[model samples]
Target chain A: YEASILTHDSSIRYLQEIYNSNNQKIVNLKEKVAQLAAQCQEPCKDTVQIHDITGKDCQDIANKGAKQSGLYFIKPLKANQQFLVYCEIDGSGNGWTVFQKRLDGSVDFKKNWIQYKEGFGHLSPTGTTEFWLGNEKIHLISTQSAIPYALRVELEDWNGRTSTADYAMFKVGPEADKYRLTYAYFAGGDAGDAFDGFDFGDDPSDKFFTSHNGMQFSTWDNDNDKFEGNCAEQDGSGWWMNKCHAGHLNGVYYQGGTYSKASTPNGYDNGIIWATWKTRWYSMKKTTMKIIPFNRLT
Target chain B: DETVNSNIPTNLRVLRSILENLRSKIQKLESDVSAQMEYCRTPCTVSCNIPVVSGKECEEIIRKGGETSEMYLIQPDSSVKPYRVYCDMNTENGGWTVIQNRQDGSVDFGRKWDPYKQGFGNVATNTDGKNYCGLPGEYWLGNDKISQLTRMGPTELLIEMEDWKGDKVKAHYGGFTVQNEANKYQISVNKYRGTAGNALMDGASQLMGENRTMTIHNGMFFSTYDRDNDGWLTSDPRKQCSKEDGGGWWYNRCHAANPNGRYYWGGQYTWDMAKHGTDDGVVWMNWKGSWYSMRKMSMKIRPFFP
Candidate 1:
């Protein structure tokens, strides 16, 4: 009777040990499967932010019509960042092209341009090679090159008339992956200023109208954020405004002013004499400058 | 021993949790890096704005001085086309300089509007104000209108070459006053007027007055004027002038009937008053009275201006 009771106890103890060991093996298998799944799955990430400095995005640019083209800039590119530029035209010589004047201030035909149809590809300042269209062909092999300061856009109309939009000096930020525009007084601004009706003779008699290419209004009033106009309206013709600063107005020169079209003063009659037209009496308070930002591909 | 076996499952669970946590962090970093690379792979557009006025429109206003209200003529430089004009309203003070946008996306000005002053053929004399503004390399006649060519030197005429056969030629006319010698007009005529003809005179047409004149002085060439052309009050052919005709200022009439028949020889190829028949060939003449119409022959005359 004693021997039978001992045998039963041993069998129960051995079965319990086998069951515990089997449970431990199953737990280990589950852990291995979980780790493998975790390794295979990719985590979610945020999309990169894009900022256009021209205030207008790529979609807003006119294809080849009256709406006209715009200019944009992304400046002071940081290290380990990649920059890209793209442009499309309707046909051969139909659309707008791109150009960049580098930090060295050289805008040569071959040196400073990527061309119209060719467009610009991604360029990393720190990368060993630049890749385009995801594994297509590598365009450039450069390291830590300087970013362009001036960006130029050339648009061609159906009439074969070509126009240009030149933008300069942009500020870039990586905090939000964007760019902010700085108010740099480039003469004539986005919209060109008025020209003095005064004679542009070989003589320097009319200093304001002759020598100076563009006139400066006032420095931006960031405090009050208001631009003051010294000259008031003289029956819609121009006014007797205070003298403004002047500088070299690059590219083309366009003239504007109501005085030339006024009824009484007769701007042409005052030929050879300095007229009120020489003053940049017009206001550009409502003008908005834009910027575009780019980030490097690590 | 019981406690040790019981703690095995707990330790496995703890190890599994640590591995999952570390995997999540690593996965997050890899995902971010991949996302950035994809962003870099995408292309972007960079763009700018400028305003301009058309060159063709601005040219007309500059040529003809303003009428009705306010207008002025301005010539930027000698490189500009002679007919290029521009306009500005003293009333509006708005005008555009000529701009050319090239294929390579470059913007440039048409020409400077300063050096070349005004339109061609307007007379402004020296202090006396009686004679033509007789600046050298210009054209004007003196007070004695009949024999004025005697004092002038050779002058090239600005006329398109009329076709004679298929060759190009040059046209020249002038006279030299000799000391105690006979003074006669001369012509250096070619098959057709080639580019060798240098009769471009700027601002010379404005000098026409009542006695309408065509004469050469100091290498300057002037043309005659007509009542219909210059709004004058005479029927004199000598005063009739067409700037396109090299300023010789003659009409399609016979010069033989005129009292001072310098250009008229009353014969073929010898300064005929009427048009030479198209098939008749180019004209050739000499001082000794030999004249003929020859297709292949090119001749030289002392006076080529006409």
Candidate 2:
């Protein structure tokens, strides 16, 4: 009886070992450096200079067996540039997934590469099923936006394993200021509503009044406006609603009389209104049906 | 000054006899009055001597003459009872089939008709072809055509009337005919009355009627206000797009939400940065289109994108 019991115990141990090995296989990697000094510098951090396992640049990441891939950032970025970050899956079944940290502290995850570690083989299967290439291989790309620093790549494995590879470092700077959109990111009521043409209101800050009417006349003698072709390029409309000034009587009501100027032009704040009494009298009256006086000229 | 007596003299033989007789008579009168009060409050049941008058009889009751009047409601309901214009109709065939009238005194003549309907036809019909019975109130048919009424007007329209204080009651009328050939089959609602049909029913004149939302003859959708200056923008025949500004702001203003469609209010703005400060969006030009992944947007010049 004792001999039979020993034999049965040995058989059970052998089966458990086989089951574990077949059910759970892990791949281990020594390093996962997405960006080297050569990959991200201003002097053309081209793919060629990047120190990859094959000594190739980003282009190779796509061309390589890594059908799904990603690139991680070592440091924050200050300038605006197109950022291409994603997961790459090589035919050999190895890839990485990474994302940038936005100003709002939110992360946009595009893919899910499974990651797992065991022994020397820290295997990160791209997908959970043999049919699934992997859920973790996602990428993100943006042009002309702020660059984040210290990004990491996450690798997922078939066996529900995950591993994060962090390496390399870099510097970041302010975003680029190349005549981009205004975003119209205003919060107040109707402040976002834009006015066009040469008609403008008075600034009232200049103790000297440029008159006829508080209306902003065309800079050129012609009737057309300054930024006739492009509304963005135009200016000289006295001050925009955004440019709240101090010491201006912009908010106080006037029954045709002028009041003492305040301290700062921005201090005047009933909300920005064009004080062009003369040229605007007719047009404003037509729309609002009330005759409001222009700001009193200094 | 004469002083009023509170009580009758009591107990004298001659006076008592006379007083007793008067008391008995007064008691009988009092009983009659009480009976009448109880009858009015409970079941003063009466039969419909008029045979329930739903269709033709109802029409005859309303169109008793060639007179029709305007109506409105102080309160709204599923019935949306209308107020009766107590005054009589001055002209024939429902007052000359009102043609064109502007809010600012402009007027014009459209095609006319002999007998007119208030757009939505009445519920009651006349086998004799003389009257069109309806609810208690009058209506402004799309045009001034009795034929239009027989053909396209609502055959089952119901109406009600209310006083200036909004006390509504079912009204009656009879005998309608077309007065002019100009407004015969054409649509020429008064321009001043918006949703309401008054030449001026406050600034809130809004269209109020059944099927008001459906597109009629015009391929465009109807709206409370004019959105586009283009005459073809709205399905409503009452107000057309014009060079001068009017109700179109609800459409022309960039932020105005679309009044029709599943996502009538589903529009939003995103930054393209390419045309940062310029008015380069569909909203700026009254394009009435949807946008996404755009390269730029502008701030000036309101556009309609319904």
Candidate 3:
């Protein structure tokens, strides 16, 4: 009877032990399987979070491995505000962030205030033939506190000839301040520095629509310009207007990269002008504006 | 011994509970396995909003990840069929789906109706089933595909030109569309804007003056070697404008800008126009006069909006 009692105790103990063991083994496998399956829910982020360690511009993309240029997603100092940008690159072209591109006049640069603010044109994965990387984004990238940027202007004439103008410094104010433009010091290029037009002799006695430094942006509707007449609407494009601009790229797209003032609808020769390249008579066949971190350049 | 006997059912109950719990967990995992498999089947690399639709045009490809000017496969929303096309990305914002590329004149375009319907040329294609490339020197994207592209939206037309002088010019038309095959792929254009004057439009026809017979080609149907749907304006019986103009084209006694004409070497060819009274060699009368042949001409298009 004593042996039988001991044997019964062992049976219960062993059974309980086996049950606990089986329970633990099953849970371990379930968790393992769960982990494996949960991998399917993992994100397929195209470009890894390199900005967390590297940079927030296209220049970094090239430094890492962007190989060539096109449209790339860039992180521009805004938290969780990453967006696609056309990185202008080739031999002479660095991975500069292109803000304006005019080719076929596909996009109507004749947008109003809100439209310019939010940005317009090609926001696609690939850059559009004509694009304006919204003024809002311009404000974001240009004024990154510690980062200083350079502005590059590229232009092509009706004869397939090309020219460029580079500004050593460039920055833009906030939307509240109408995205004020701040650029000076001509770096180089045959296109000439249309940004700093010939001095107006101050009294502003010799005031003209030339010289576009420190001007607030203007559209036909939102007039923050020097001249009472809205040349933005008259010119059929948006731009930073003092009275107007010495050179405005966001103008009508004239074929052959040139057009006469007589051909213009409003007689304002504002079709993608870089006065240093040509007078009001010529409209560029192609006009592109890009920005790069000053440090990216040698 | 009495205590052990009393606790027998309790241990047995505990084992039963353990077994039940294990069974339930394993069953839950089985369900989870199915769901996880589904998640593995598909994916997204960008925003959760982009659709998984196939590349339909150069613009759609741009929306995906195509770079620069290159050849790409496109399928219109009207059909499941896909075909090759040259995308001129360097032009006015780049996604211009080229309908015709007339450079070097390697491909003889004076083919019959069916050949024009099916594209042909010394164009780049695939080799060894590897990555294909675009060589858009000379090739027509066929009238069928043009119809599909034009039908995609409020389309625009771009005609880029270059003369022997190496001077470049382009014309832009705000509205453009092509009728289906049943309609002989007739074309309509309006709102002309460009440095290259509207050669497609008859200057006199817009105002209906002295020469009403000299009509424009704005609403003309396409004519090929076999199919003849041209010249109802001028009183000419059986002119067969396609033959006089040197290739297939939309004609009106033939045209002021017959881009499909014969290729003359160095921009100076007045033999056809002087002899046959046809502005036949890559004519664009407005820019290079009605005599000289063009060095290069490219016709491309895209939606009115980006």
Candidate 4:
């Protein structure tokens, strides 16, 4: 019995070794560390400089054996540049590169052009991780491979009910074009499409009352919006403001979910607005935007 | 430490077995990831991961964003053959695989053992104007197929019945399964719910025509026109319940409900069952009694997997 018990103990240790061996290893030298120290600051602490593992997007990361959602480093196609991003591997087994998420008011959305262009917020494997995973990196990830990226917006109301909106196509222009917003084909959802308000393919005369299709990213520094004053300065958040917004996810995070301009002591309510769902005033409890290759099933 | 370790033999035995099993499961997980990666790469529209090897149920379909209700060929297990089933992707929160359907009285259901075993009538919509199955008629989605479907997991049964007077009643049973053919396709049902009374188990067994007795149909073995395994428990020569009732079904000596019974034309089967003998015609004794033949019904089933 004692001999058999030792075999059992050996079996357990073997199992642990097998599990640990699944995730491999990495390496580098002095010049690599010296070059890294010159550019980035301490806030890029969570960033992992991957060596051998290569991926264009989260879908490629999934193929490279990503079991769960985590922040990882990836290099896009054609571009030698690499960056950190949060990859979501939900129940569908398809990986999605989570570009934007709003959980709490911990990170400020009211940033200038440089901040919006580069990025902001925390990226962690667990709680309190919120961020706009930067449009520059987003553009790189979306335009990387032959497969075009699709957008999925996950929304949750104060009532605890959740909803999702899927777009068949999602892409953005470079910084020279002011990171122009271009997304269409609202596939399905209960929360409704607040992104593409109008199809610009029809008439040139029509303008954006709520639609933001042909809009460019605007901030306090950059007034790319068609509105008289900077929409970002007026609304207190950087966004692709056409005339205004149908879904301004980065607007403002109100504490209790329901907030209006009249309710505020400062005489202005700018809560996170997904206009079609609970209207523009009712601030959503949570918002998450993720992108996957449209042909993921293929 | 050795003294304490001596008492852990039984515990260690259990732990060893569990650890051994867990390791194998982890090994399977290794392959599961590879297959999943392959599934992720297969590039067709709608779904390319469909028609997979693991066609145990409709979960794969729902997982692939198969929202539209339509006919799909699904296989239960590896060895079992693939069969066509109408997936109810829109009703009752959807993802239900329809096992049987009897709409208008257009198709003949008075079938034999062979026909019942293999299945009869149209599998889907007969665009050629034949009045059966999806063409608004009747169909039995095989005993073997039903057994295969319900064998793997806890399946739910939904019985939607309609009478001539527009009376609708449903009986939803959970943990429903029919045993393999070797066991004579014995029904094993549980947790009765819905408007229609639990006719399968609720009704009382009574004395039959001769010095015989008949039990309720809950635990009944299925009987057909030729194979009389109704458990009549008597020497009575008139034991062919499926032949007498002009249908194949789960007959317990007889039954409180027979959704497979004879579909009376115009719902006018003027057979006075009490005076005549066996109360035939599509019967649900709990609903409108045995004599009042039902007009329309659809018995669908699904695994509670989502």
Candidate 5:
């Protein structure tokens, strides 16, 4: 009986020691898995930026890789409003960042400006990428009511940089030509003041069209020499005739147009032109001027 | 020069007094008495306060230069013609100068005498009064009295492919004189009252006159006297407003106080709050050959308190 009891005690002690070692190993493995999961969940912030055409190069030569992610997404407001967008790229216009704002929106945008920053996705040989920035700094004009809006960014046409990305489904948001045209008019404060006489406007003043062989374009001045200063009203019957008729883009003036002359005023921000007409239309973004987004995606 | 009655101030007493009295009465009625007068109230019609005019009411008054009135003669073809009364210009105290109202006429000796034994064929005036008959400046309205092609007064006023240096100037009333070598009377004409001239009252401001005369020189004057006072004056009141919005003295207040804002030609009233009442109410309209607007306007008459 004594020999049997001693043998039982020795087996129990050995089994207990093995069980303690296995429990410690399990805790160590669980910690490692948790760390890996955290690393995978966070999104990558480093991405390429995008830009719009400025009657210049086809590729983002000057704006490429300049603290900008290629344009990956956009979120539109009104179906009939357009934005005045600009972009900065490396000299190659590639891998650049874009900045965009509504040319004609709230009144605050007209008198002042607010700003915001958005990242771009890396350039892919193909496919459209869409995304929005949840956290960003933005500015807006003043308003009586607070504008509670959701920030949404989107990008389309990820199909190989050169593939036509028209009307393609974008994870960025709803896919449609969501941008509309903005319009407004302006003049000096005083009526009797000496201003450029009416019936005074450039009737298709452009030399580049003939010089470029087929690249047709014209610069219409309000006879006020406003290109060098603030915008002024054209006195005479002046209109930006988009003469792109029957495939003859060169003839485009005020009559026919595919892309209309955005604004007749110089030094006037297209984003805030609405303020000239309406009273308070937006929120107070910045203390000094209304805030607008300066960063953009291609 | 035509004997301007010293009794008549530049604001002729006979004409000015009647117009002033009428104006006062109208204002009194508008401010106090007439305010109670019922105008279109419900679904109100756009009631504009135009001067009351009628043959039985003011025809005789108009003929005697009581008020500068005008009318349009519409043809069967829908074409319209306007007649006007001519006013004499002093041309000395910055007043209206004189010229033969004949196309083939001459106003030599500074328009002192009408060597042209003919009637008022053409009214002769020069674009540059300082250098009349000089090259690059001789514009004489001829007595042709024809279409745009035959218009002979003020060659400068003509639409020339070349030689017409007139920079699309707009005015209420403007004309020129031409002198045949012999300086005989030929004809008189005015700036195109229609589209030819860009005056608001191009075909308006026609009126008759009592003793009113456009004095050019001694014995050289035109008159529109109504013998029976039936308002049947021989002279065409249409000629006075041949140019759009002619007769700036009475028509355009811009010249009444300061001629600086004397815009002879009407332009598209741009967005100007100061000049115009508002940007929305563009006050660009045609009067005698000039642009006029009630929007940017102020009229006041000070009563003498001696």
Candidate 6:
């Protein structure tokens, strides 16, 4: 009986020692978990950086990529100044065109790399102006207008469904001082309701105002027999004219001097343009109307 | 042996076993409680590295908040998606999380910003009654500084006008914008006639049948106005017409086309001419190129983001 009691006492003490050890292990684990939770609780600081494509002198904007077309934000040398640039790649996958709008609804600035006659030939001696490489600063030209605070670019697919690309929060730098031209495309309001060019309540001043389809600007001054600051559609032979000559119907031409029959079979990738009465240009199909207001600061 | 027999009695043995089992369970409970308390005290450590979110991500977001706090999301690639940051102002406090769908009919990108949340934190009360007719002044959508630098692309407002009577019926004002410009400041209308709850209905030109006589004017009411050194940049379509064209802006026809017709009210009439009574009122644009009144006075307006 005495030996039995001693054995039982020994077993009881051993069990007590195990319980204490288990409790200490749990305490240590709890401490580690507490520390982990506290570390996770710390907030991370938010940060962002804008690449100055032009200021840094990198000019390969279109060639560096797989020819993806989309809206990209361009940051200048100034901190608070940033704007959006719309890049469109050519079909052959060789080159691209860059476009922007002004605050007053003008689509004036365009940098095209296509050297074909109907392309950027009229604007430069080399059939093209500066090539946009995406890494260079957007060169604001003398004929282009103000940099709008926002711009909206839309496109219609073969199914007639429309998709819009809208960009806002435009921070303009001091370098945006080019020219100011206001333009709007009157894609005939609601169906066959067609009209002539936009009639600003006031008349034109020192500003140059013209209308064009994608084919040609009103370049050939019929009265002067020379190119003038007017915009209109172009005919098949690449002659800047007031009306279309069948084959070049619905072609697009901006007053900037270039024309394209490319808008014929598939319509313009951007939109189509047409000629109205003599001096006015109109976008017939509702899907063809888009306005980018540019305000030229002195 | 005699000493062991005396010390280790049956009661002592039973008590020791019971105490050991009870302690094990109690320690487990204590540890669980401590760990849970630590979790509750932590703020947030959630990351939204992907451009998209699923239903489970929503659950994870809720869990990361851990019962009470805010959650933030940032999209580094604007081409893929817009940046979205949401905060649940402490479950112990408020419960309004801003929600909006993308243009492609997707809801994966929805969140909230500060000044755009509920309550008039930025608007100041009028000291005098006469100042109530116009906008209270420019109030930024997010904060004064951040919003100025960031360009929030084309935004639309899906507004609905409440019925003057107790029937509670309302009319849809459709989607409107500050015209494609950078419109950050919001001008709210706190009252319409007398109550802040009701305004005129839109649909037809006349006040006949279900159609009431309230039509939104272009470049005047609810149009984007520029605040750069007070050099205003008005909206399109109606930017060329006189301010008094009641149903002006871009919809039916140009006001300059038919100047003498009954339809052309080119900045020559008062909104009271279209109001139903003190309980009912109409919102229109004046010839001065501004909305007839501040939003919510005779009507209310709210802008939606993309």
**Number of the predicted model whose DockQ against the real structure is largest:** 3
Clashes of each: 71, 106, 12, 4, 150, 42
Q: Write the per-residue lDDT of candidate 6 for residues B74-192, one digit (tens) a residue.
A: 23233432223332334223221222111111010011222223111111112233211111211222232222212232222222212222221222233333322234233222222
The residue-level lDDT of candidate 3 at B266 comes to 85
For model 1 the interface RMSD, in Å, equals 25.0
Docking class of 6: incorrect
Candidate 3 off by > 4 Å: A1-55, A90-93, A123-128, A198-208, A264-266, B1-306
**Candidate 5 lDDT over residue span B277-302, tens digit each:** 22111122233222332212211011
Model 3 lDDT on a 0 to 1 scale: 0.69
Quantify all predictions' global Cα lDDT against the true fold.
Answer: 0.24, 0.22, 0.69, 0.68, 0.21, 0.28
Query: In candidate 1, which residue ranges exceed 4 Å CA deviation?
Result: A1-298, B1-306
Interface root-mean-square deviation (Å) of every model? 25.0, 53.0, 16.1, 26.1, 51.8, 17.9
Count of clashes in candidate 4: 4
Question: For model 5, how big is the CA root-mean-square deviation?
Answer: 41.8
Q: lDDT at A279 for candidate 5?
A: 14
* Candidate 5 TM-score versus the reference: 0.16
DockQ-based CAPRI category assigned to the predicted complex of candidate 3: incorrect
**DockQ values per model:** 0.01, 0.00, 0.06, 0.01, 0.00, 0.03
Winner by lDDT between candidate 6 and candidate 4: 4
Off by over 4 Å in 5: A1-5, A44-244, A248-298, B1-306
TM-score of chain B of 2: 0.19
Q: Once all C-alphas are superposed, what RMSD does model 1 give against the true structure?
A: 40.6
Query: Candidate 1's residue-wise lDDT over A176-284, tens digit each?
Result: 2111122222322222222232333434653453222222211112111111432112112111122321211111111221223242353222111112222332211
